[PDB]
Design a protein around this motif. Structure first.
Motif, short mmCIF file in Angstrom:
data_model
loop_
_atom_site.label_atom_id
_atom_site.label_comp_id
_atom_site.label_asym_id
_atom_site.label_seq_id
_atom_site.Cartn_x
_atom_site.Cartn_y
_atom_site.Cartn_z
N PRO A 239 1.20 33.97 77.92
CA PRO A 239 0.50 32.69 77.74
C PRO A 239 -1.00 32.83 77.60
CG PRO A 239 2.14 32.46 79.40
CD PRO A 239 2.07 33.91 79.11
N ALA A 240 -1.61 33.78 78.30
CA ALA A 240 -3.07 33.90 78.28
C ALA A 240 -3.58 34.30 76.90
CB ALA A 240 -3.52 34.91 79.33
N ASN A 241 -2.77 35.02 76.13
CA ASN A 241 -3.18 35.52 74.82
C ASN A 241 -2.87 34.56 73.68
OD1 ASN A 241 -4.19 38.00 75.79
ND2 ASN A 241 -2.13 38.87 75.80
N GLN A 242 -2.34 33.38 73.97
CA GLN A 242 -2.07 32.41 72.92
C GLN A 242 -3.36 31.77 72.44
OE1 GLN A 242 0.53 31.12 71.16
NE2 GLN A 242 2.04 32.56 71.96
N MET A 243 -3.46 31.59 71.12
CA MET A 243 -4.61 30.93 70.52
C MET A 243 -4.44 29.41 70.46
SD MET A 243 -5.43 33.63 67.45
CE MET A 243 -6.87 32.77 66.83
N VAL A 244 -3.50 28.86 71.23
CA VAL A 244 -3.38 27.42 71.44
C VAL A 244 -3.06 27.21 72.91
CG1 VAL A 244 -2.48 25.28 70.52
CG2 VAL A 244 -2.31 27.36 69.15
N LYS A 245 -3.58 26.13 73.48
CA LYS A 245 -3.45 25.87 74.91
C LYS A 245 -2.15 25.12 75.16
CE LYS A 245 -6.43 26.15 77.86
NZ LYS A 245 -7.05 27.12 78.79
N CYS A 246 -1.10 25.88 75.45
CA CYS A 246 0.18 25.29 75.81
C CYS A 246 1.00 26.37 76.50
CB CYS A 246 0.91 24.77 74.58
SG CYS A 246 2.25 23.65 74.99
N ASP A 247 1.42 26.10 77.72
CA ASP A 247 2.22 27.05 78.47
C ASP A 247 3.60 27.11 77.84
OD1 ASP A 247 2.45 28.80 80.90
OD2 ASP A 247 4.05 27.37 81.37
N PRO A 248 3.98 28.19 77.15
CA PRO A 248 5.28 28.18 76.47
C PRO A 248 6.46 28.22 77.42
CG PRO A 248 3.85 29.91 75.64
CD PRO A 248 3.32 29.49 76.95
N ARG A 249 6.23 28.50 78.70
CA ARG A 249 7.31 28.54 79.67
C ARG A 249 7.81 27.15 80.05
NH1 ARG A 249 4.00 32.58 83.68
NH2 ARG A 249 2.45 31.00 83.15
N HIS A 250 7.08 26.10 79.67
CA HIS A 250 7.56 24.73 79.81
C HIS A 250 8.42 24.29 78.63
CE1 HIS A 250 3.66 24.21 82.31
NE2 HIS A 250 4.65 24.62 83.07
N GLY A 251 8.81 25.21 77.76
CA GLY A 251 9.64 24.88 76.64
C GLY A 251 10.38 26.09 76.13
N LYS A 252 11.01 25.92 74.98
CA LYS A 252 11.90 26.91 74.40
C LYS A 252 11.45 27.23 72.98
CE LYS A 252 15.83 25.24 77.05
NZ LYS A 252 17.20 24.68 76.97
N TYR A 253 11.76 28.46 72.56
CA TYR A 253 11.38 28.96 71.26
C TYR A 253 12.52 28.77 70.27
CZ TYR A 253 7.34 31.46 73.31
OH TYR A 253 6.18 31.82 73.93
N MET A 254 12.21 28.12 69.15
CA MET A 254 13.18 27.88 68.10
C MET A 254 13.24 28.99 67.08
SD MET A 254 12.67 23.83 67.27
CE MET A 254 10.90 23.72 67.40
N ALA A 255 12.14 29.71 66.90
CA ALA A 255 12.05 30.82 65.96
C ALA A 255 10.76 31.55 66.23
CB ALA A 255 12.11 30.34 64.51
N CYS A 256 10.60 32.71 65.59
CA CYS A 256 9.44 33.54 65.81
C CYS A 256 9.40 34.64 64.77
CB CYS A 256 9.44 34.13 67.22
SG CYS A 256 10.98 34.94 67.67
N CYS A 257 8.21 34.88 64.23
CA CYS A 257 7.95 35.96 63.30
C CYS A 257 6.93 36.90 63.90
CB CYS A 257 7.45 35.44 61.95
SG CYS A 257 7.09 36.75 60.77
N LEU A 258 6.92 38.13 63.38
CA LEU A 258 6.10 39.20 63.94
C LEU A 258 5.68 40.10 62.78
CD1 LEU A 258 8.10 40.08 67.10
CD2 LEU A 258 5.80 39.22 67.11
#
Ligand SMILES: CC(=O)O[C@H]1C(=O)[C@@]2(C)[C@H]([C@H](OC(=O)c3ccccc3)[C@]3(O)C[C@H](OC(=O)[C@H](O)[C@@H](NC(=O)c4ccccc4)c4ccccc4)C(C)=C1C3(C)C)[C@]1(OC(C)=O)CO[C@@H]1C[C@@H]2O
Ligand SMILES: Nc1nc2c(ncn2[C@@H]2O[C@H](COP(=O)(O)OP(=O)(O)OP(=O)(O)O)[C@@H](O)[C@H]2O)c(=O)[nH]1
Ligand SMILES: Nc1ncnc2c1ncn2[C@@H]1O[C@H](COP(=O)(O)OP(=O)(O)NP(=O)(O)O)[C@@H](O)[C@H]1O
Ligand SMILES: Nc1nc2c(ncn2[C@@H]2O[C@H](COP(=O)(O)OP(=O)(O)O)[C@@H](O)[C@H]2O)c(=O)[nH]1
Ligand SMILES: [Mg+2]
Lengths: 429, 441, 345
Positions: free
Chosen positions: B298-317
């Motif tokens: 979470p600390a390295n995200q470039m947007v302020k939102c704790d992702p642990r309060h939600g779920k990931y639908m997809a992700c690219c790398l």
């Protein structure tokens, strides 16, 4: 190319403008003749905001001096930076106002104003794009109180889709320099709340305090009070002339600072002001300017924000800085000092930056503010008014030039009504 | 050939482009004037890469971009600065007057009579391109230009160009930090249109990058030309598969498919994990596992939102540099084994993967370090609703009193339009609840 | 301060739009006026104090032109005889059914003549010797926040129209300086004076329709209850006065969709501001009754300023919204209903 048409009205406006052009010329590198003697190229890229051009690399200002009954044309022309103004713009007449709002609105103004506007046209059409107007007057007299406001009405009729900034000196809670200040002030506010987008309520006692406490000046003259007003006058319009990181204009500072239209009476301030001794014992950083700005001694309005709630404030910074410091320090104020702000606007402050500071400093600033404490400035006059109007005090010099009693009452209600719009938002909902 | 048109609206877009092009010209071997010395010395290669830079017969290189801000105080720094002999003089200043931080000005009354030049230059740049597939746009949700001109432009381009990917790398307002007191309004009215017109709108927040710039780069007094240099690296990690070679390549018509489940939830995030300083560049391995795990912090995200309060639908790398595939297919497994990171039941596959061989470039006068590998994540999360509601509440606080609204109706706006936009913003914070529900049978 | 009353009236259909044979979006489950798109992505539901269903002559609870009078307008008359002031508004855009409800046609009457007729009826019933009434009528507008009188100089007099100005008596209230009002005796004179006015309402032909009003028309009547001389001497409370205001407002007309510049844009900008300030005033006045310290912003608009003595105090207010049942106007219709909710709460 944004452009501002300055107007002077009365003794106050003439002297303040004489000190304002002496502070903008130095900022741009212009001499008393109009010639250029700068050192940087960045002073000419946007010199069109105040100055017109001329033949021999000369630069003439866009001033329109107006003062019925002279005594100051001599003082400005004879002065150091007087022979740069256009002589056709030295408008005036005889038979001074006599500290009447009537003689400067109805009798003598009505037979001069049509010659004043005829210059505004001649100085407005030559602008590629016009951002607004900038008037400098003082309530209490006759020219600044009556004639400036008549001009404001006549100009808001012709050029409505613009900005009419008006940097107004106001009466005080103590010793005054004029006896009929309350009536002229009341009758001006009735004509300055309906026909204006941004007004700065300057007081002289707050400037005496700034000059005797911070600056530690022992014998301050009127030419040292204006040296403070000019700072704000330049700082507001810096984001048009010079560049930066978060630019701005007179319209950003009018859309954010005015939630409702009548509440456009602001409360200015400038930092970093200091004595010559304490200049070696201080540091120049963002938080020092923030503390020196939000302090109740650097405001020029003779009102305490600690007796009210800020609805919206601004901070036009100037210098090479870091916005991580600026945003952090402007949020710290809202977090720590929360009771001095309202909750039905989430963020109460915006920020503007320019990369080009003042001639002798490394970082300056300029604070605007819209508090409810301006209540206390208009809760005073409306008392003085209704201490005099009851007994029909110095009024035969007003009715005797074509003014009914009703016009005195209307201006009393509007002011009072304005006081009931600031005080609505001063207690918990 | 492959091409991408990059539009830069407002001060934010301009100050980001002035770094993005500073980086691209150095990646490709182009001086600030346009002339490359590499083509005459080596005598080969397409280092004059046509994805961003068109070429003239005189050895000059002309970028595929446009600028417009309705204020000349910004672009005139380009016309008089270090990058003047590169860009076409048609940098569409029309700034006789700025947009006052209100959508009503950037939409109709200073946004009309100016847009025709934009839509003409875009046609002129598209006629020069054969296999165009992208209209990148850089703006800010906050201001009048970024909110208004962008919505006046995307609605026109969806008519003109239509079946063509558009990507908005925007600046979402922060919860606490802000530089204006109208962002709760200019942001809601933008979503009401770009939600229908755009295809994948990324989002960044200056508060997050400020925090990143102190906890990893050791900068206590940062400015905007430090954050824009990370945004440039994001866009370069994105647009690299177009230009340089790689094992697994990822075009812009693949983010649009592997990150957008429904057409209304196309608002992902963005990260760039190794932002390490030259001091901390040593004392560290900087392998694929470390970087991939750091992308999910979470600390390295470039947007302020704790992702642990939600779920990931997809992700690219999108990897960049010396990377091997099994390092990646071992890094992702460690993520799926972890129970703090969740994935929707309707996406067990989850990950899109992309590899490239050209490492990053170190812009001088900079804070970033030299790295043999670098990564950019692009996640779709159900958590950003909590970032949207924070705006909506603010709206509801300063619309019950009808504050600052007269400055909008004073420039061609209706009251009910604000209400309609709020209704559109409420439908979207409900769908994010629908996608987050586990199925039942 | 009494409560504001808000209602809605749906027109059946226009034969002009019926050439397209568009669809129906509005539905009524008694008082929940539901709206549905053709796509049915969402379904909106609005609840108000009163609801008039004039879609077709089949449903029970059909609200004929008669039914508005006994339900909303007659209490205004009943209270005007008690000395209290009244105001009625009307909010809907071009083609809503608005002027159909204000006046209608000579065969299907609206709300004005059926009100002013029962007025004279209850007068002539009580035109005794102990009491004697006097009526006076005026009719003006608001164009770009300028007051004009629709019954003066008839144009073609060098200048076009007379921009009168508002002033404030200390105790009587706001008023217009230069409004020769009129005198009336019966109903036909009202109709003559009003037909003389509406021809001069400064309408303009926008793209949506050839006749679309760009002014807020105000119709004011003044009623006096004069009493007789008491046995002891010549002094008697014969100054019981009341004021009836009836307003026909204009449409919001968002300008992005309707590409309009030059002068219609200024008109639109003047019309959206007056509507906003009116909504703020009504919301503040309806929040004052429930118990709160709130400032009522009258002075920020002329129409809210002249009528200061008709909304506040102990006076009564009323508002009628008019909406089309079609889908083409779905972005228009909803806006109206949303404004009505802001009047209810
Ligand atoms: C070593 C040093 O710091 O010199 C400063 C200085 O000591 C101080 C006290 C200066 C000094 O100004 C005053 O003492 C003063 C006297 C009466 C009223 C107001 C100020 C200074 O004289 C004033 C002068 O300010 C400027 O030159 C700016 O350009 C100023 N314009 C003018 O002063 C000016 C006036 C008339 C003609 C030409 C220039 C300015 C302010 C705001 C926006 C634009 C320009 C400066 C740097 C200084 C001295 C010289 C000591 C200060 O001036 C201002 C407005 O910033 C007074 O407080 C500040 C803080 C500075 O530290
Ligand atoms: N990351 C980043 N954000 C910026 C920069 N400059 C401005 N912003 C953001 O932009 C917002 C202001 O809106 P802008 O669209 O930039 O204003 P503008 O482009 O000058 O257009 P106007 O609103 O009409 O003045 C602020 O909230 C900032 O957070 C920048 O250089 N970098
Ligand atoms: N309640 C109703 N019952 C039956 N027919 C109606 C009703 N309301 C409206 N209509 C019909 O629909 C028409 C409405 O259109 P029109 O009268 O031109 O709008 P308008 O309100 O009068 N113009 P404007 O003053 O700008 O609102 C009427 O003329 C009738 O033919
Ligand atoms: N700051 C400042 N105020 C002034 C100056 N001269 C006059 N005043 C103020 O102006 C007020 C009197 O107004 P005046 O200038 O006479 O207006 P006029 O009568 O229309 O010319 C008083 O309150 C003074 O304090 C000046 O040079 N500087
Ligand atoms: Mg801008």
């Amino acid at each position: 190319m944004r452009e501002i048409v300055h107007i002077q009205a009365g003794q106050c406006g003439n002297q303040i403008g004489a000190k304002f052009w002496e502070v903008i010329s130095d900022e741009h590198g212009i001499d008393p003749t109009g010639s250029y003697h700068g050192d940087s190229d960045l002073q000419l890229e946007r010199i069109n905001v105040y100055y017109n051009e001329a033949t021999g690399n000369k630069y003439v200002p866009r001033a329109i001096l107006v003062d019925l009954e002279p005594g100051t044309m001599d003082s400005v022309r004879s002065g150091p930076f007087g022979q740069i103004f256009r002589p056709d713009n030295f408008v005036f007449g005889q038979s001074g106002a006599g500290n009447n709002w009537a003689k400067g609105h109805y009798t003598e103004g009505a037979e001069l104003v049509d010659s004043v506007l005829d210059v505004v046209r001649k100085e407005s059409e030559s602008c590629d794009c016009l951002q607004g107007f900038q008037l400098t007057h003082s309530l209490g007299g006759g020219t600044g109180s009556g004639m400036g406001t008549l001009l404001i009405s006549k100009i808001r009729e012709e050029y409505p889709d613009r900005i009419m900034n008006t940097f107004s000196v106001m009466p005080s809670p103590k010793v005054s320099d004029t006896v009929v200040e309350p009536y002229n002030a009341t009758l001006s506010v009735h004509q300055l709340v309906e026909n204006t987008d941004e007004t700065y309520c300057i007081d002289n006692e707050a400037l005496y305090d700034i000059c005797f406490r911070t600056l530690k000046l022992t014998t301050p003259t009127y030419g040292d009070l204006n040296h403070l007003v000019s700072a704000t006058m330049s700082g507001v319009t810096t984001c048009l002339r010079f560049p930066g990181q978060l630019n701005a204009d007179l319209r950003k500072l009018a859309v954010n600072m005015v939630p409702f239209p009548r509440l456009h009476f602001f409360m200015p301030g400038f930092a970093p002001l200091t004595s010559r001794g304490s200049q070696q014992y201080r540091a120049l950083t963002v938080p020092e300017l923030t503390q020196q700005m939000f302090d109740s001694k650097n405001m020029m309005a003779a009102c305490d924000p600690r007796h009210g709630r800020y609805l919206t404030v601004a901070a036009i910074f100037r210098g090479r800085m870091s916005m991580k410091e600026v945003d952090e320090q402007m949020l710290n104020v809202q977090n720590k000092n929360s009771s001095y702000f309202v909750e039905w606007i989430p963020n109460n402050v915006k920020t503007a930056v320019c990369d080009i500071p003042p001639r002798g400093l490394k970082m300056s600033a300029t604070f605007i503010g819209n508090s409810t404490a301006i209540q206390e400035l208009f809760k005073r006059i409306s008392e003085q008014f209704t201490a005099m109007f009851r007994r029909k005090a110095f009024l035969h010099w007003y009715t005797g030039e074509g003014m009914d009693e009703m016009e005195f009452t209307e201006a009393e209600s509007n002011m009072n009504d304005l006081v009931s719009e600031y005080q609505q938002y001063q207690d918990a909902t | 050939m492959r091409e991408c048109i990059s539009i830069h609206v407002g001060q934010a877009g301009v100050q980001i482009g002035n770094a993005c092009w500073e980086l691209y010209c150095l990646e490709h071997g182009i001086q600030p004037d346009g002339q490359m010395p590499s083509d005459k010395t080596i005598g080969g290669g397409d280092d004059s890469f046509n994805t961003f830079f068109s070429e003239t017969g005189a050895g000059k290189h002309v970028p595929r971009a446009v600028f417009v801000d309705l204020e000349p105080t910004v672009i005139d720094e380009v016309r008089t600065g270090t990058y003047r002999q590169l860009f076409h003089p048609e940098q569409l200043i029309t700034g006789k007057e700025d947009a006052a931080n209100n959508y009503a000005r950037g939409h109709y009354t200073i946004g009309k009579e100016i847009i025709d030049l934009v839509l003409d230059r875009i046609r002129k740049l598209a006629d020069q391109c054969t296999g165009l597939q992208g209209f990148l746009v850089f703006h800010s949700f906050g201001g009048g230009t970024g909110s208004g001109f962008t919505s006046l432009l995307m609605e026109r381009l969806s008519v003109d160009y239509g079946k063509k990917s558009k990507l908005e790398f925007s600046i979402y307002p922060a919860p606490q930090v802000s530089t204006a007191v109208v962002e709760p309004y200019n942001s809601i009215l933008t979503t009401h249109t770009t939600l229908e017109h755009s295809d994948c709108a990324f989002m960044v927040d200056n508060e997050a990058i400020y925090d990143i710039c102190r906890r990893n780069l050791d900068i206590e007094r940062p400015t905007y030309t430090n954050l824009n240099r990370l945004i440039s690296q994001i866009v370069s990690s994105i647009t690299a598969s177009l230009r340089f070679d790689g094992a697994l390549n990822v075009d812009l018509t693949e983010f649009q498919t592997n990150l957008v489940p429904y057409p209304r939830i196309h608002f992902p995030l963005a990260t760039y994990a190794p932002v390490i300083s030259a001091e901390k560049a040593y004392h560290e391995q900087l392998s694929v596992a470390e970087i991939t795990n750091a992308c999910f912090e979470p600390a390295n995200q470039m947007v302020k939102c704790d992702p642990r309060h939600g779920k990931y639908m997809a992700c690219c790398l999108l990897y960049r540099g010396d990377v091997v595939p099994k390092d990646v297919n071992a890094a992702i497994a460690t993520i799926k084994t972890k129970r703090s990171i969740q994935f929707v039941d309707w996406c067990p596959t989850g990950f899109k993967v992309g590899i490239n061989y050209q490492p990053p470039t170190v812009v001088p006068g900079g804070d970033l370090a030299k790295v043999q590998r670098a990564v950019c994540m692009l996640s779709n999360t159900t958590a950003i609703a909590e970032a949207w509601a924070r705006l909506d509440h603010k709206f509801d606080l300063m619309y019950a009193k009808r504050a600052f609204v007269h400055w909008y109706v004073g420039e061609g706006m209706e009251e009910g339009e604000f209400s309609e936009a709020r209704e559109d913003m409420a439908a979207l914070e409900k769908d994010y609840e629908e996608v987050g529900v586990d199925s039942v049978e | 301060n009494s409560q504001v009353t808000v209602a809605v009236r749906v027109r059946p259909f226009s034969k002009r739009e019926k050439t397209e044979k568009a669809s129906q979006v509005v539905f009524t489950n008694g008082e929940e006026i539901t709206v549905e798109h053709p796509d049915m992505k969402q379904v909106y539901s609005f609840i108000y104090d009163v609801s008039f269903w004039s879609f077709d002559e089949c449903h029970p609870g059909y609200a004929s032109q008669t039914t508005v009078y006994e339900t909303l307008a007659a209490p205004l008359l009943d209270r005007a005889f008690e000395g209290y002031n009244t105001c009625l508004f009307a909010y809907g855009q071009t083609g809503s059914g608005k002027s159909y409800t204000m006046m209608g046609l000579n065969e299907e009457p609206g709300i004005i003549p059926r009100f002013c007729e029962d007025l004279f009826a209850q007068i002539a019933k009580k035109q005794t010797s102990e009491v004697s009434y006097h009526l006076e009528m005026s009719f003006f507008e608001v164009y770009n926040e300028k007051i004009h009188d629709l019954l003066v100089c008839k144009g073609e007099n060098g200048q076009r129209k007379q921009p009168l100005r508002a002033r404030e008596h200390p105790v009587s209230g706001p008023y217009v300086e230069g409004l020769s009002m009129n005198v009336v005796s019966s109903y036909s004179d009202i109709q003559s004076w009003l037909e003389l006015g509406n021809k001069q309402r400064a309408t303009a032909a926008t793209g949506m329709n050839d006749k679309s009003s760009r002014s807020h028309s105000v119709f004011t009547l003044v009623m006096t209850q004069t009493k007789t001389e008491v046995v002891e001497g010549e002094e008697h409370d014969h100054r019981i006065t009341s004021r009836i205001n009836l307003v026909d407002l204009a449409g919001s007309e968002r300008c992005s969709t309707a590409h309009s510049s030059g002068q219609r844009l200024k008109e639109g900008v003047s019309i959206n501001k007056s509507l906003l300030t009116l909504g703020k005033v009504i919301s503040a006045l309806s929040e004052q009754a429930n118990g709160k310290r709130v400032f009522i912003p009258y002075r920020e608009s002329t129409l809210t300023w002249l009528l200061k003595e008709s909304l506040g105090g102990n006076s009564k207010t009323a508002m009628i919204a008019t909406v089309s049942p079609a889908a083409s106007n779905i972005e228009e219709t909803l806006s109206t209903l949303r404004y009505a909710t802001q009047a209810r709460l």
